[PDB]
Amino acid sequence: KDIPGGCAMPIVANWAYSKYYTIGSLYVSWSDGDGITGVPQPVEGVSS
C-alpha cells in the first residue's frame, strides 16, 4: 500500500507495444545504511 513520504513504482502492460496501462505498485521508502545489502547470488548460507 502507500507509505508516507516514499517513492513508488508502476507496472504496466503492453498489447503489441500499442497500449500502456499502469497499476499502482510497490510503495517503497528507505533509510540509508550499511547493515542491509542486496546480494545477487540466491544461495546464502555457511559456505566459503
Add this chain to the structure above:
Amino acid sequence: KDIPGGCAMPIVANWAYSKYYTIGSLYVSWSDGDGITGVPQPVEGVSS
C-alpha cells in the same frame, strides 16, 4: 488526513532503540507569508 501537494511527517516508536515502526501523521502544506508567525512564548495577550 492527506493534503494534495503537501509535505508529511512520520511518528515512530522504539522498543529499546531496536524496533522502528512509523505512522502516517501530520499532513501539512503551506503558503509563504508575513502574517502568520510562530512564537515560542506560550503566553499571548495585552502585555508589555
